[PDB]
Amino acid sequence: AMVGSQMTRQARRLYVGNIPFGITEEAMMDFFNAQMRLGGLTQAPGNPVLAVQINQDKNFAFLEFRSVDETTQAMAFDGIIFQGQSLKIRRPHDYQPLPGMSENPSVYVPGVVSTVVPDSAHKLFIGGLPNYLNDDQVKELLTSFGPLKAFNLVKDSATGLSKGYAFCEYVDINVTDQAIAGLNGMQLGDKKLLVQRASVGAKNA
Numbered sequence: 413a414m415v416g417s418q419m420t421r422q423a424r425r426l427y428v429g430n431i432p433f434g435i436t437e438e439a440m441m442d443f444f445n446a447q448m449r450l451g452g453l454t455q456a457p458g459n460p461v462l463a464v465q466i467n468q469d470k471n472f473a474f475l476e477f478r479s480v481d482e483t484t485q486a487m488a489f490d491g492i493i494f495q496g497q498s499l500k501i502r503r504p505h506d507y508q509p510l511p512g513m514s515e516n517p518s519v520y521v522p523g524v525v526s527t528v529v530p531d532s533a534h535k536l537f538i539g540g541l542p543n544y545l546n547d548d549q550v551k552e553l554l555t556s557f558g559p560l561k562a563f564n565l566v567k568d569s570a571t572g573l574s575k576g577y578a579f580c581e582y583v584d585i586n587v588t589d590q591a592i593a594g595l596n597g598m599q600l601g602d603k604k605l606l607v608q609r610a611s612v613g614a615k616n617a
Contacts, residue, residue: 423507424483425465425476429500433471437464440473444486447494451616453485460486484509525551526562529579533611534588538595539577540605541565546574553605554580554595558587576603579610 428440441461448454460482465474477483490501520527527547529535541550547565554560565578582588588609596607 419507420480421476422504423480423509424462424478425474425504426483426486427502427504428473428475429471429502430498431471431473435466435473437466440464440475443494443497444475444489447489448482448485451485451488453482455479455482480507480509481512525560527564529562529564529581531610532581534581534585535610535614536580536582536588536592536607537577537610537614538580538605538607540598540600540603541574541576541578542601542603543573543576547578550574550578553598553600554582554591554607557591557594558582558584 431440441459441464444461445459448460454460456479460477460479461475462478463476465476467473475483475486477486487501487503489499492499516528538550538554546567547563550565551560551563554563559582560580561583563578563580565574567574582591592607592609595605598605598607
């Protein structure tokens, strides 16, 4: 091509800084490829990095990814220390990344507990749930302290079954910490149910 593919060129490519002058394609490539695997960012198998571009006599480089969604998550490493190296990634405002959020259908009934739990500052995570119980059955355990405005149990589309974890939000803010106080550690059946505020950094900081 000639003067084409400009949008996706800079959209799949991020600005890498805080690099040592003389760093090689393979060096930076393998590092990021590994991190994606570690953080569970790699949505596709293999290497997320497609091509590494180092401008001559410049103290910076550019990393091109096969997918923009795999690109944007590399930007999360901006200011992070991986294995002693500090990575700096700048956000190119020549394009717009689309958030990887799947829109919820009307799978809830207005006037009752909603199956959509927003990521509030009172976001709650429940784990340890028996596979033979769904959100409705599990509500009985949570409702012991207070009712839920929203309770969504994440089931697996491949199993058709409850993975054993859900997210809730209590209608009142006082019952939030009062419920998690007693519910967390509930030894039901074979499992102790984990009940924890997800607003502390749910498997990611």
